[PDB]
Curated annotation (Swiss-Prot), chain A:
<comment type="function">
    <text>Component of the ubiquinol-cytochrome c reductase complex (complex III or cytochrome b-c1 complex) that is part of the mitochondrial respiratory chain. The b-c1 complex mediates electron transfer from ubiquinol to cytochrome c. Contributes to the generation of a proton gradient across the mitochondrial membrane that is then used for ATP synthesis.</text>
</comment>
<comment type="subunit">
    <text>The cytochrome bc1 complex contains 11 subunits: 3 respiratory subunits (MT-CYB, CYC1 and UQCRFS1), 2 core proteins (UQCRC1 and UQCRC2) and 6 low-molecular weight proteins (UQCRH/QCR6, UQCRB/QCR7, UQCRQ/QCR8, UQCR10/QCR9, UQCR11/QCR10 and a cleavage product of UQCRFS1). This cytochrome bc1 complex then forms a dimer.</text>
</comment>
<protein>
    <recommendedName>
        <fullName>Cytochrome b</fullName>
    </recommendedName>
</protein>
<comment type="similarity">
    <text>Belongs to the cytochrome b family.</text>
</comment>
<feature type="transmembrane region" description="Helical">
    <location>
        <begin position="32"/>
        <end position="52"/>
    </location>
</feature>
From Swiss-Prot, chain C:
<feature type="modified residue" description="N6-succinyllysine; alternate">
    <location>
        <position position="2"/>
    </location>
</feature>
<feature type="modified residue" description="N6-acetyllysine">
    <location>
        <position position="73"/>
    </location>
</feature>
<feature type="modified residue" description="N6-acetyllysine">
    <location>
        <position position="9"/>
    </location>
</feature>
<keyword id="KW-0999">Mitochondrion inner membrane</keyword>
<dbReference type="GO" id="GO:0006122">
    <property type="term" value="P:mitochondrial electron transport, ubiquinol to cytochrome c"/>
</dbReference>
From Swiss-Prot, chain D:
<comment type="function">
    <text>Component of the ubiquinol-cytochrome c oxidoreductase, a multisubunit transmembrane complex that is part of the mitochondrial electron transport chain which drives oxidative phosphorylation.</text>
</comment>
<feature type="topological domain" description="Mitochondrial matrix">
    <location>
        <begin position="1"/>
        <end position="24"/>
    </location>
</feature>
<protein>
    <recommendedName>
        <fullName>Cytochrome b-c1 complex subunit Rieske, mitochondrial</fullName>
    </recommendedName>
</protein>
<comment type="subunit">
    <text>Component of the ubiquinol-cytochrome c oxidoreductase (cytochrome b-c1 complex, complex III, CIII), a multisubunit enzyme composed of 11 subunits. The complex is composed of 3 respiratory subunits cytochrome b, cytochrome c1 and Rieske protein UQCRFS1, 2 core protein subunits UQCRC1/QCR1 and UQCRC2/QCR2, and 6 low-molecular weight protein subunits UQCRH/QCR6, UQCRB/QCR7, UQCRQ/QCR8, UQCR10/QCR9, UQCR11/QCR10 and subunit 9, the cleavage product of Rieske protein UQCRFS1.</text>
</comment>
From Swiss-Prot, chain E:
<feature type="transmembrane region" description="Helical">
    <location>
        <begin position="12"/>
        <end position="34"/>
    </location>
</feature>
<keyword id="KW-0679">Respiratory chain</keyword>
<dbReference type="GO" id="GO:0045333">
    <property type="term" value="P:cellular respiration"/>
</dbReference>
<dbReference type="InterPro" id="IPR029027">
    <property type="entry name" value="Single_a-helix_sf"/>
</dbReference>
<dbReference type="GO" id="GO:0006122">
    <property type="term" value="P:mitochondrial electron transport, ubiquinol to cytochrome c"/>
</dbReference>
Length: 54, 54, 101, 31, 51, 418, 411
């Protein structure tokens, strides 16, 4: 068995992200959700560097 | 043939692929930065103070 | 009748599920009653529905459409899931009516 | 089961540069 | 460690030595590029913009 | 060169050849078999031949497997209702290691209970895959329905015994049946002196006889297996003569008169009387053969038919009638000579492969102790006369029948009807 | 004595060339039986779409009648002699052989001539063969391993004539007229495209005389691998079948031995096997395994990991074990008159000469761990594969996943 299916953190990552059954006909709109998370990350990172001087 | 040596030497092993990627990153960074700076300086020549200070 | 049939045909053509080779019952939302109705379908109808849905998904992924000749025709459509779904809904309503007495 | 004929994919295959004596291995390496 | 003392492991290390060297070079050049060390980036023929 | 069945003082019959083939083949044929077990330890032999790779007193399971693989040879175990063969095949320069492995596997096995428990589930899979072809299943039911004491014991462990074969039973069977006087060591590539040396390694083997028992009493019973299969396989048999007898040769020549198997790819079996009879009997696809097995205590000559259920009876009836016609005396001389040619050619062509030659030599050493050259076999086959074949057919027709069938069984006649 | 000495003990196979071109080969031995056969360098690869099933149909009706004697007479003679008449057809080879007694060597050879030179194509027999073959295709549909291998060939070679099955489509066999079979025979069954090979108790001079007598009347005179995939889903089937392969070198290539050693080097899988199917200029090197519905991904991962380990980290002990396994398989396969006769015919058809066992041992001895890993990287590493899956195929990784697994990011 691959290491991704043995380590519990790797288990979670593989099950939720690497090997998640996803419809093939999904259009571009479903991208935005992922983008949202990225935006959040940006707001968490960039804003953090703003807090160091505000 | 070009590919018969290129792919066999550089793109065969992924480690060599990463190595040539990083070397290309260095060279591209230098050359692209120089070219973009030259373009920006030429487009607004005279306005910039690097020319005025002379 | 004739006027209503014309409006219904216009709506069927306007709704694009026929372009993808689908039938009306393939479009119905998969809730519990529809799930059991699908489970009650005969194997041939179940396989035909599965292939039609898969072909529609493949076409939608390619952003393509089945050729105009192969489009489902409003005058030549089978409501295969209607009897099974009606029976399931009837049984559920009977259970609820008994459970409210 | 003998109806194994794969539908034609020629309209999607990478347009070969020329019909040279290049071996299939060399063409795969180039692609 | 005792189990690894054998000819087969020596052959394996010999096989993987080129890969280890290539990855070490990748890491070193990546560090030099990211930090712009300029101790090393002065020797390279190009990339002499650090006047 | 030629073989020489030298018998060691303990009782181990040692035979060697000098075929210069690069693969040296060795075979230890023990007289132990499924017939030598009883109701108490039924199915022991089936697990016994699956424990070849288990750890022994002198070698471990891992050591045995890895050494056999690295050498490139193979250690296999073949089993019949009377004999059990351990056959080891290696390169010419790699004989000693695998011979020691064979010694450890046979003379001093160590049936670790956990290993036996882990191996036991393999019995289900082996039985299932071996029952995939209907012939084996029907023949097993036929042996169960024909004999009652010894040969009725199945080659594959019964379903109820799959998970309850204790290692104590394995040890008891090995130490009561794997004895020097009931074993024979045969080496094809191995030259005689090294074969003598490995036999000397085998010199201190258990005792000098085993718990041989039973007599394989015959019952006219029948086993019916009602299944949903469209095709039905039936096999009805009568007691023939023991193996190694002139009457056994007569029964074999009779089976080749009736038709044992195909001779032309996709052929219609024009010579086969049974195939011709069933062709006019039924039009759907069929397959008819004259089953014939011979043993030390008894024998079984009969008809095996694979047909459609709706026609089943008809088919077998036709086949039966054919033998009856031969019993009446309607046996010409041309087809007799054709069958004799078929038998001689089949024997000689079977002997071609080194594996089958080794098996034949081992069986002869176990049951006779002196090698029978193929010329003598051909002479004995030619000795069979038409009257002897008619007598064999009469014995089959007049004898008590035992039948085993499997399939839809909606039209198959019972033993009394057949 | 030693392995090398034992190989030297093997008798050579005398080869002679007739005037028409027929190549008669033999291997004398002391056995009382023999197997004499005709191997024709004609197969499904040489058949266009119009006659895809021509060779198979001719294999069917070859024993059902010749001009000199009716099919019943031919079969009756074979049975009376005690011999066994058999035939097979591959995508590149055809063979009709007779396993007989040594003293029956003359007649058998004559028989082969009657099968080859003057074959009687009875129209009634042709229709009967049509019906039988239509039944046989549906029968073979049950066997899913052969279906998987046919899928693999079809998806791997596609446009190449090497992808069509030996049996041919149902519509092709239905419409395959007698004239088409006669034209196929005329254009294909001709010397020197044929080899008469015998083994066992046969003298080469006797075989040559018989060939001149009965086989002298014979008339004197771009393959492309596409890494595609096919998956036929059928969840009712108990187990899933998978066959994954990559391009392999043809018969004429020194790398075949190293690839054989690598395959020998190669349990989640219920039944897992490795195949090295070789052709003229192409080939399929890969593995076929049967799986549970829930374990396809793990088995594919294990197989590809073994492939990558061989391509990158091939130690000496494993290569030595593979070489020993290959030697044992080579020697054990050539046991019996039929296997050696088939080897003689095929080797004359593909390699030329007979490639004696001593050369095979020397070539295997040349093989080294470095050679094994180099050739594996040459043919296996980072190569687009051809995949064929027979249902229930759902957990089988998508083609992009398989292709990505065909290489290592660590390497």
């Amino acid at each position: 068995t691959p290491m991704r299916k043995t380590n519990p953190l790797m288990k979670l990552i593989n099950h939720s992200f690497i090997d998640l059954p996803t419809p093939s006909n999904i259009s571009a709109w479903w991208n935005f959700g992922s983008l949202l998370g990225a935006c959040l990350i940006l707001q968490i990172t960039t804003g953090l560097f703003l807090a160091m001087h505000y | 043939t070009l590919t018969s040596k290129l792919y066999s030497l550089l793109f065969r092993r992924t480690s060599t692929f990463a190595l040539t990627i990083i070397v290309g990153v260095m060279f591209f960074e230098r050359a692209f930065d120089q070219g973009a700076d030259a373009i920006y300086d030429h487009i607004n020549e005279g306005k910039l103070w690097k020319h005025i200070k002379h | 009748g004739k006027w209503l049939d014309g409006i219904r045909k216009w709506y069927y053509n306007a709704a694009g599920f026929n372009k993808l080779g689908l039938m009306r019952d393939d479009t119905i939302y998969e809730d519990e009653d529809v799930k059991e109705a699908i489970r009650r379908l005969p194997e041939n109808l179940y396989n035909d529905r599965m292939f039609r849905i898969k072909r529609a998904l493949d076409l939608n992924l390619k952003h393509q459409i089945l050729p105009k000749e192969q489009w489902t025709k409003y005058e030549e459509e089978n409501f295969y899931l209607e009897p099974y779904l009606k029976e399931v809904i009837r049984e559920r309503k009977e259970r609820e009516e008994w459970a409210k007495k | 089961h003998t109806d194994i004929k794969v539908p034609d994919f020629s309209e999607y295959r990478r347009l070969e540069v020329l019909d040279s004596t290049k071996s299939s291995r060399e063409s795969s390496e180039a692609r | 460690v005792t189990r690894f003392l054998g000819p087969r492991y020596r052959e394996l290390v010999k096989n993987w030595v080129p890969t280890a060297y290539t990855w070490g070079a990748v890491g070193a050049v990546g560090l030099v590029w990211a930090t712009d060390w300029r101790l090393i980036l002065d020797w390279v023929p190009y990339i002499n913009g650090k006047f | 060169q030629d073989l020489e069945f030298t018998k060691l003082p303990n009782g181990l019959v040692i035979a060697s050849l000098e075929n210069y083939s690069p693969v040296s083949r060795i075979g230890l044929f023990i007289k132990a078999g499924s017939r030598y077990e009883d109701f108490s330890n039924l199915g022991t032999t089936h697990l016994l031949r699956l424990t070849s790779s288990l750890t022994t007193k002198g070698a471990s399971s891992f050591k045995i497997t890895r050494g056999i693989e690295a050498v490139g040879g193979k250690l296999s175990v073949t089993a019949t209702r009377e004999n059990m063969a351990y056959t080891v095949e290696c390169l010419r320069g790699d004989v000693d290691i695998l011979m020691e492995f064979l010694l450890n596997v046979t003379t001093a096995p160590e049936f670790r209970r956990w290993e036996v428990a882990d191996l036991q589930p393999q019995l289900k899979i082996d039985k299932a895959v071996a029952f995939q072809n209907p012939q084996t299943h029907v023949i097993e039911n036929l042996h169960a329905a024909a004999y009652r004491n010894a040969l009725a014991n199945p080659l594959y462990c019964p379903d109820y015994r799959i998970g309850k074969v204790t290692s104590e039973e394995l040890h008891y069977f090995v130490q009561n049946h794997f004895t020097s006087a009931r074993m024979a060591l045969i080496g094809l590539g191995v030259s005689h002196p090294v074969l003598k040396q490995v036999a000397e390694q085998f010199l201190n083997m258990r005792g000098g006889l085993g718990l041989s028992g039973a007599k394989a009493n015959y019952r006219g019973g029948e086993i019916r297996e009602q299944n949903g299969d469209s095709l039905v396989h039936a096999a009805f048999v009568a007691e023939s003569a023991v193996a190694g007898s002139a009457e056994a040769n007569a029964f074999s020549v009779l089976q080749h008169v009736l038709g044992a198997g195909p001779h032309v790819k996709r052929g219609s079996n024009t010579t086969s009387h049974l195939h011709q009879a069933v062709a006019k009997a039924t039009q759907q696809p069929f397959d008819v053969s004259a089953f014939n097995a011979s043993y030390s205590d008894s024998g079984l000559f009969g008809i095996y038919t694979i047909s459609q259920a709706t026609a089943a009876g008809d088919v077998i009836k036709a086949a039966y009638n054919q033998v009856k016609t031969i019993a009446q005396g309607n046996l010409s001389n041309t087809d007799v000579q054709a069958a004799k040619n078929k038998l001689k050619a089949g024997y000689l062509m079977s002997v071609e492969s080194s594996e089958c030659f080794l098996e034949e030599v081992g069986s002869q050493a176990l049951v006779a102790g002196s090698y029978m050259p193929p010329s003598t076999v051909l002479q004995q086959i030619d000795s069979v006369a038409n009257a002897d074949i008619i007598n064999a057919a009469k014995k089959f027709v007049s004898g008590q029948k035992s039948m085993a069938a499997s399939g839809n069984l909606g039209h198959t006649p019972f033993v009394d009807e057949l | 004595a030693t392995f090398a000495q034992a190989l030297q003990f093997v008798p050579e196979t005398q080869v002679s060339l007739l005037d028409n071109g027929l190549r008669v080969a033999s291997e004398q031995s002391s056995q009382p039986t023999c197997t004499v056969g005709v191997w024709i360098d004609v197969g499904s690869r040489f058949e266009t779409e119009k006659n895809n099933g021509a060779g198979y149909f001719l294999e069917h009706l070859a024993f059902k009648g010749t001009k000199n004697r009716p099919g019943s007479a031919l079969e009756k003679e074979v049975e009376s002699m005690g011999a066994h008449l058999n035939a097979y057809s591959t995508r590149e080879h055809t063979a009709y052989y007779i396993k007989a007694l040594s003293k029956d060597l003359p007649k058998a050879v004559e028989l082969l001539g009657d099968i080859v030179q003057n074959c009687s194509l009875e129209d009634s027999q042709i229709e009967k063969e049509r019906d039988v073959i239509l039944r046989e295709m549906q029968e073979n549909d049950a066997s899913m391993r052969d279906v998987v291998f046919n899928y693999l060939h079809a998806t791997a070679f596609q446009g190449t004539p090497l992808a069509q099955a030996v049996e041919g489509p149902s519509e092709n066999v239905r419409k395959l007229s007698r004239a088409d079979l006669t034209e196929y025979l005329s254009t294909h069954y001709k010397a020197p495209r044929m080899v008469l090979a015998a083994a066992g108790g046969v003298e080469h001079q006797q075989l040559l005389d018989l060939a001149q007598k009965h086989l002298g009347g014979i008339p004197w005179t771009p393959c492309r691998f596409t890494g595609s995939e096919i998956r036929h889903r059928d969840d009712a089937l108990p187990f899933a079948h998978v066959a994954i392969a990559v391009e392999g070198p043809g018969w004429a290539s020194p790398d075949n031995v190293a690839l054989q050693v690598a395959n020998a080097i190669i349990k989640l899988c219920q039944s897992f096997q490795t195949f090295s199917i070789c052709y003229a200029e192409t080939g399929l090197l890969g593995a076929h395994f049967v799986c549970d519905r829930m374990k396809i991904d793990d088995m594919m991962f294990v197989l590809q990991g073994q492939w990558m380990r061989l391509c990158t980290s091939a130690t000496e002990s494993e290569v030595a074990r593979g070489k020993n396994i290959l030697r044992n398989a080579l020697v054990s396969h050539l046991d019996g008159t039929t296997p050696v006769c088939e080897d003689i015919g095929r080797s004359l058809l593909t390699y030329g000469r007979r490639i004696p066992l001593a050369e095979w041992e020397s070539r295997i001895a040349e093989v080294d761990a470095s050679v094994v890993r180099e050739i594996c990287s040459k043919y296996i590493y980072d190569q687009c594969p051809a995949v064929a899956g027979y249902g229930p195929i759902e957990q089988l990784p998508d083609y992009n996943r398989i292709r990505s697994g065909m290489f290592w990011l660590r390497f």
